[PDB]
Amino acid sequence: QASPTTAGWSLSVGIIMCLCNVFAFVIGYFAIQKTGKGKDLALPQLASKKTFGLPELLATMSFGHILGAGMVLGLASSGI
Amino acid sequence: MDGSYAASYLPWILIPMVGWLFPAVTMGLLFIHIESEG
Amino acid sequence: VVQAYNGDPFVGHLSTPISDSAFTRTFIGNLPAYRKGLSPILRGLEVGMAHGYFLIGPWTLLGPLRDSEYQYIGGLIGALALILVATAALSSYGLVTFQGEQGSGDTLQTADGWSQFAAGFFVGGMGGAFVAYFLLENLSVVDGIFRGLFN
Amino acid sequence: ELSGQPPKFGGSTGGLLSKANREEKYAITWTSASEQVFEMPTGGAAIMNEGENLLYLARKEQCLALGTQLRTKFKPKIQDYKIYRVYPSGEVQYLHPADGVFPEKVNEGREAQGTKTRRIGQNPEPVTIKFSGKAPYE
Amino acid sequence: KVSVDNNPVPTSFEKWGKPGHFDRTLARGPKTTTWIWNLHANAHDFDSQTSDLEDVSRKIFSAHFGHLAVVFVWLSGMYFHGAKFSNYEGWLADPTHIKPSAQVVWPIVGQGILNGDVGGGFHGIQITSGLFYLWRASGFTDSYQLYCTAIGGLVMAALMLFAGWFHYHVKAPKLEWFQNVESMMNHHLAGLLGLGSLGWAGHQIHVSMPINKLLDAGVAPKDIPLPHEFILEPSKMAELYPSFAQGLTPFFTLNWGVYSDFLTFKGGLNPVTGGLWLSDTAHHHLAIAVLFIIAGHMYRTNWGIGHSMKEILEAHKGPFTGEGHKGLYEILTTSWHAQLAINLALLGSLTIIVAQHMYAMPPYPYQAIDYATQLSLFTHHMWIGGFLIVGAGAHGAIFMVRDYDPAKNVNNLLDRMLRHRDAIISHLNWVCIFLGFHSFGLYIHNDTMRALGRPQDMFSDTAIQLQPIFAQWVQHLHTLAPGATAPNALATASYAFGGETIAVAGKVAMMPITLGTADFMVHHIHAFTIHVTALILLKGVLYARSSRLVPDKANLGFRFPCDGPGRGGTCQVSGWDHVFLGLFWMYNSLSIVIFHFSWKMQSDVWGTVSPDGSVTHVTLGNFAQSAITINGWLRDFLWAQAANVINSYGSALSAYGIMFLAGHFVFAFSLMFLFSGRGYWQELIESIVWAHNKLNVAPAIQPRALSIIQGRAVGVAHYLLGGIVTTWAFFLARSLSIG
Amino acid sequence: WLTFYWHWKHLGVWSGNVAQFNENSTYLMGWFRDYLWANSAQLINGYNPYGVNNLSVWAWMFLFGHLVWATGFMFLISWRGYWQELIETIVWAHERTPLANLVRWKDKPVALSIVQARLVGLAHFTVGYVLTYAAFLIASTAGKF
Amino acid sequence: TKFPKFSQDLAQDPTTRRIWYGIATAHDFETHDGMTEENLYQKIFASHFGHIAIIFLWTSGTLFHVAWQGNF
Ligand code: CLA
Ligand code: CLA
Ligand code: CLA
Ligand code: CLA
Ligand code: CLA
Ligand SMILES: CCCCCCCCCCCCCCCC(=O)OC[C@H](COP(=O)(O)OC[C@@H](O)CO)OC(=O)CCCCCCCCCCCCCCC
Ligand SMILES: CC1=C(/C=C/C(C)=C/C=C/C(C)=C/C=C/C=C(C)/C=C/C=C(C)/C=C/C2=C(C)CCCC2(C)C)C(C)(C)CCC1
């Protein structure tokens, strides 16, 4: 009665879709700018990730993870 | 509440007198007297 | 939305949606106490009828005679006595404050007017309670009247 | 007659009451070199206009509480303040800097009253002034 | 963002021999006895000592390190007493028949009688701290485990004490450093509470849970393997809770529900334990932990991500409130009293939440059985929470006197409400009068109707009744919550709302607490007593600076007796005197709360359950019919339950007997100070002094009656002491004798 | 002290149990337990959830005395300046309340004087002192004889 | 004549303090306005007569009630 989804497969797609959503969220609006030391990424691309500066990519991967977990476990719990 | 003692109808009216009339009047009359010129 | 009262900020009062809104100015202003024009006699009559009417309430249902066949009369008698005191309390206050002079601004606030208001309140109050009692005692009649029982 | 600019203020409840329009209210004027924030004795905060200000308060003690503040809580110590007692009859009455100079400083012209050609311990016995409306200090 | 001044103050013992050095008034010397009292009452008032906000913040910072140290010594004392002067091991063997006892009394002057028989062949004083119940749930099974814990406390104690010295005499933080609020919060929200909750969940799962599961089986402590042995053999940790076969990686693969073997949501009480499921509290703190780490990533720091509370506050303006929260950031990062005022208000209200939650949902084994510990932990945390929310009014007022600046507060929320303080109090005044009649007035209506032989008129379940329709409706929802509004929760969070009557041994651990008109009334007594206490304290904050009576009250200060007999009398207008009166009402308020608690649980909850299931309460349910008149409280609660303590002479409880009187004494003694004034007392001393001038024994430090403030401070100090000593003895003697 | 001493001793004489006083009046708990707590039993049951008897008055008067006694503590502990500042807010309320400002007091509301509060505080403290004790003296003695 | 006729100091008090202090100083004749020594005693002398009568009126109350409603 405490039923989750416990598997691989599309699990990574779920969180990566959220990582993407958050990278869209951060550039959407933020205090996006130089903080700490960022390896620097050019324009948008895979660099759209690293363009957010040092903490932002690192901070979006955080939110993107939790948003994934919240989204994954929520889809797995389904409606019943 | 009525008692055997004679004149058993006095307390019937007089407790009301002491209770409502005697105070209401004196309370009022005193209230008027504090009010005046001075 | 909340500012100074009448533009005078040093008047110890604020103008708010309760104190000085469009509504409350209208409502309170048209209440019988402040309605422009009316003679004090009618002012009190109105305030009486309203208060006397509802004042039978508590004793009619929660009085000592609630638990007998006399609850309706026990309530009326309770309201009557309560109003009588209120009348004298009114007539007395006027008798003392308005001892000296007058106040030609508001007729309600002088010896003559305030006595008219006291008298007005008395009859209004007495009438209010008595009629409300009349409807509770003959409530059976009122019931059928509304639901077309007697046609 | 004499006047000023009412300080910029949203309003408070600690202000005037019926006494102001029945018995008496007090008025206080002062001149300031700039618009700056000051504390109302009626609570809250207000800001005085640059130049002449005018303010009605309910009690004499309130005005003097503000007057002392004006003279102690500003870099330009405002000692230019004047207090009046205004009756509903229109009659006004000068009160503070009474004669002209503050009472702190001795000034010629002031008539002495309340003084005693006597030590405080040299007052008469209460039995001496028996059944007379007078007290020992009279 | 670290800034520090190196060695700002030398470390010398010269100042120790110069008392009152911290104040320029006392520094020169004592001429009267008033100097002595003033040395003590100004000791921690660091504001009045120096106006350098950097210097005081350093004093406060190292004051805390000193405090954490004594609390460590105290806490270590409890562990040491539990290790060497306890019957804990004896209690762990037979939890349901042995009474927990620490502290052995020395046989002398006949005081050995206080070492009463608590079962298990152990003589000592029966404790009500619930420490034994805490130890088991914590996984303690040996005296040595407690002993090592006691030493660790002294280590910490010494370590905390060193830090206090180090951070004021070696490396004192700059004022800039203390002002890192956004960052300070991120660490407490995640480092203290987050990791603290996560770290403890790790202990519960690896030590407490498996061990405590064996105590359900009753393996007995010595047969149970040591805590660390569960880690050396993951086979052991697997044999219980099968979900360790796939141990790690379901967490990282997000399987999670595999762990449901030991991370449950039963939501109830382990029927053998009488306490909350450790499987729940572990899953709980694991959930709280994560939530707290998360919440610790909201605020602005050095990496540009986060929030500026200054931005958030200022960006909260509305039509009704003018400029809004503008300036609130500043005053909360410049005034300590501003912070302390809030922190007390919440910490104090929280300690109350602890009490009301710990009794309905007993989190420890065999706690619910011990009605003494249940009554003792509840009323305890009640008072602490009570005292704190009074100081919340003290410093709330001190801020207004000392650190409120009109220029930095213009037409903002703070200033705006100061501009209708007369409107606030006028209504809070009325509410208190309304609650006053419509709560207490009801009891007087009953007591009078009763005596007049008119029981049909009074307010009662049997006669006319005021039914708490809502609170009852709330219970109905809480009991019907599982399988609907809480599908993954098996049973309701607390059976106080409704359900099966849980029993352990032959006693009631927890059962549905029905609400009647008897309860409706005391609830509105509580609302009444609370509102008056707020009124006294709130009025004390808003009128701290000024009034129509004294516009220059702010200049007089926070702590002053009065402004002379003028104006009809101006005694006790100060904010300090609003804390003074606020204390009596905090007391009067809570005394009724703990009296509600004691009688209600005794009468309508606690008691002995027969095997069949029928319950016999200790007061036979006389609450709902007697708790509706004062004479009923006087008779069926006080007069009745006080029989235990007054007859305690000659028993182990004889202490509570004479302590019940001791409270009474200092209570009356307090009235000596609260009813008089120093005017009389100074004149008396003059006559007394003369007798010493006569024999040449007059003291150099001239005798002086206490200050008017101290006269009041001492007054309330004794009144609240005795008032609580009395209850303290009455509750213990009562609860220990009943079970 | 005086009347407690007179009463507890005669309650032994009238009872034939002088041994009670002689053996328990040498320590304070004895007075608390044997004289106060015990001889209240009939009194506090003047009325109860079950019935009413001739001691119903004294039971009621017992609490009444307790009430006045403690109402005395207010005037004795709390002093004027607090109350004066609380009254003016009420003064404010009435002047601002519509319909009510229609009535204006001919006597300005003010807190009791300093001496007055001591006096009234003492008055209450005294009334409650005798009314509480009297109701106990009569009920305890009349109830027991 | 405002209340406290015997004290203009109190009569002028525009507050409620007048009523209270008017009562508490009523029986202190020495404080009264224009009170002489000769006019003092003459008020005391009369005040005693009224007091004696009350005592006799009181004892009359006990006798009267016992005879009327008592089982003597
Ligand atoms: C945005 C991410 C997110 C988060 C944090 C949650 C969190 C939660 N959901 Mg899920 N849900 C989501 C997305 C999310 N959901 C999506 C996209 C769907 C499909 C539309 C669902 C459908 C769903 C169903 C059907 C159910 C839930 C339920 C729950 C709760 C049950 C606990 C649990 O089993 O899971 C694991 C617990 C966690 C992952 C803890 C998360 C708590 C954190 C740390 C707070 C995060 C705050 C947020 C990120 C703040 C910034 C965002 C901003 C806009 C404010 C939990 C509060 C259950 C419920 O509550 O019933 C109504 C349930 O039955 N959800
Ligand atoms: C001071 C002595 C005294 C006291 C304490 C009482 C007390 C009482 N009387 Mg009695 N009464 C008294 C003298 C007293 N009476 C005398 C001398 C007579 C014959 C004239 C009566 C004739 C009388 C009748 C017919 C009745 C009572 C009744 C009562 C009871 C109800 C009150 C009432 O009706 O007022 C009535 C008062 C009067 C009729 C006038 C009484 C005469 C004067 C006023 C007594 C002197 C008072 C004293 C000087 C005032 C000092 C107080 C000071 C602070 C001003 C009450 C127990 C009623 C009752 O029996 O209830 C069960 C009732 O029906 N009384
Ligand atoms: C969060 C903790 C905390 C902290 C750090 C402070 C800190 C401070 N307080 Mg606050 N206070 C607090 C909580 C706190 N308080 C609470 C919860 C209340 C509500 C009661 C108060 C009420 C309060 C008042 C009214 C005042 C302060 C004042 C002060 C300042 C000076 C205090 C002093 O001189 O000590 C001196 C301490 C003493 C002289 C000891 C007094 C005797 C005590 C406390 C009785 C204790 C009873 C005892 C435990 C039981 C009897 C046992 C006995 C028989 C042996 C200082 C900044 C003062 C201030 O701001 O200066 C103007 C002041 O006016 N506090
Ligand atoms: C135990 C005696 C006692 C009593 C009865 C009170 C009563 C009161 N106090 Mg407290 N007070 C006390 C002790 C007491 N105090 C002590 C010892 C202190 C010092 C610590 C204080 C400090 C204090 C403060 C600081 C405050 C109060 C306030 C109040 C009032 C709150 C408003 C209210 O309840 O509405 C109505 C009154 C009652 C419900 C009391 C019962 C009255 C009855 C049952 C009515 C009787 C019927 C009717 C009058 C019959 C006619 C009789 C007539 C013909 C003579 C209330 C009058 C607060 C206040 O002023 O109001 C906001 C206030 O802030 N008190
Ligand atoms: C023996 C006869 C006697 C006489 C003729 C006087 C005469 C006088 N005294 Mg008093 N005195 C007396 C006895 C007497 N005294 C006793 C026995 C005491 C000790 C208590 C005192 C202590 C005393 C003090 C301290 C003072 C006087 C003062 C005075 C003078 C003014 C009195 C006044 O106006 O205030 C009148 C005051 C009142 C009327 C208030 C009294 C309140 C009452 C009676 C309590 C009632 C409570 C309640 C209703 C009772 C029923 C209970 C109910 C609730 C069920 C006056 C010359 C005053 C003075 O200034 O001297 C020049 C003054 O300061 N006297
Ligand atoms: C059983 C009893 C009868 C129940 C009837 C139901 C009544 C429900 C109570 C309504 C409360 C009204 C809230 C004002 C809604 C409100 O906040 O208005 C909005 C206004 C401020 O709004 P702004 O637009 O300024 O907001 C934006 C900025 O201010 C940012 O802060 O607040 C005020 O004006 C102050 C008024 C305080 C009113 C004092 C009420 C005291 C509490 C009374 C309720 C007690 C219930 C117990 C729990 C608290
Ligand atoms: C407005 C309103 C309100 C209020 C309400 C209320 C409070 C109610 C009421 C009500 C009432 C309270 C009413 C009343 C009335 C009345 C009437 C209608 C009367 C009458 C009468 C009569 C008709 C009588 C007559 C008579 C006389 C006079 C004498 C002789 C003859 C006879 C007996 C016939 C509110 C704000 C809340 C809301 C909104 C609306």
Side-chain angles (χ1 to χ4, degrees), chain E residues 316-321 325 413:
Chain E
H316 275 69
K317 330 168 196 171
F320 293 106
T321 52
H325 302 81
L413 290 162

Side-chain angles (χ1 to χ4, degrees), chain D residues 42-127:
Chain D
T42 67
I47 70 102
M48 63 189 70
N49 306 99
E50 187 167 323
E52 312 164 19
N53 297 275
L54 179 65
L55 210 183
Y56 307 91
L57 287 165
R59 285 185 59 202
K60 189 194 174 180
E61 174 172 29
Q62 288 183 326
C63 301
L64 275 161
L66 173 57
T68 309
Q69 197 202 153
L70 278 166
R71 200 224 260 84
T72 58
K73 290 193 192 169
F74 294 91
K75 290 185 100 174
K77 303 203 312 204
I78 300 172
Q79 331 197 359
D80 344 342
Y81 71 97
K82 294 172 191 164
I83 292 174
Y84 301 79
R85 162 178 298 141
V86 42
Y87 296 93
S89 196
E91 181 185 321
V92 300
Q93 176 187 112
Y94 193 52
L95 271 175
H96 207 34
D99 52 282
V101 186
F102 295 124
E104 306 144 25
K105 301 294 132 117
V106 58
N107 197 19
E108 299 284 0
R110 292 168 193 172
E111 303 288 359
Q113 58 195 261
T115 53
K116 293 268 188 196
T117 58
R118 182 215 306 171
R119 301 215 324 282
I120 181 156
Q122 276 184 321
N123 273 256
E125 296 291 353
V127 65

Side-chain angles (χ1 to χ4, degrees), chain E residues 191-245 247-252 256-260 262-348:
Chain E
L192 211 179
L193 304 170
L195 296 189
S197 186
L198 201 277
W200 177 249
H203 179 77
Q204 275 201 126
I205 293 166
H206 284 59
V207 174
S208 297
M209 275 197 72
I211 285 173
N212 228 109
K213 185 176 179 178
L214 315 191
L215 300 178
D216 310 336
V219 178
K222 235 151 193 158
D223 264 87
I224 293 171
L226 299 170
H228 53 80
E229 207 67 54
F230 285 88
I231 305 174
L232 270 287
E233 248 74 13
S235 58
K236 282 179 169 58
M237 271 263 59
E239 186 147 26
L240 310 168
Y241 321 116
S243 51
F244 266 78
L248 261 295
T249 68
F251 166 91
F252 285 100
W256 287 26
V258 58
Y259 299 136
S260 68
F262 60 109
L263 295 180
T264 62
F265 217 104
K266 280 163 186 156
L269 297 168
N270 182 8
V272 65
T273 306
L276 290 171
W277 287 101
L278 293 191
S279 57
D280 293 335
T281 63
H283 172 206
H284 173 211
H285 298 162
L286 171 61
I288 295 295
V290 156
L291 220 195
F292 275 163
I293 304 292
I294 285 290
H297 293 83
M298 178 165 45
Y299 298 134
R300 177 124 297 162
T301 63
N302 300 317
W303 294 265
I305 73 173
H307 280 270
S308 163
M309 302 194 210
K310 180 180 162 71
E311 257 78 313
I312 301 168
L313 289 168
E314 288 193 18
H316 275 69
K317 330 168 196 171
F320 293 106
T321 52
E323 219 70 359
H325 302 81
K326 203 188 202 300
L328 298 186
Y329 186 103
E330 283 75 356
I331 65 176
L332 278 170
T333 190
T334 57
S335 181
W336 284 89
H337 288 266
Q339 283 289 340
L340 181 57
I342 289 169
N343 301 345
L344 246 51
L346 273 285
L347 178 61

Side-chain angles (χ1 to χ4, degrees), chain C residues 23 27 45 49-51 53-54 123-124 126-132:
Chain C
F23 173 90
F27 197 63
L45 198 77
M49 285 168 59
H51 286 73
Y53 184 87
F54 87 81
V123 171
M126 288 307 167
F130 192 98
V131 132

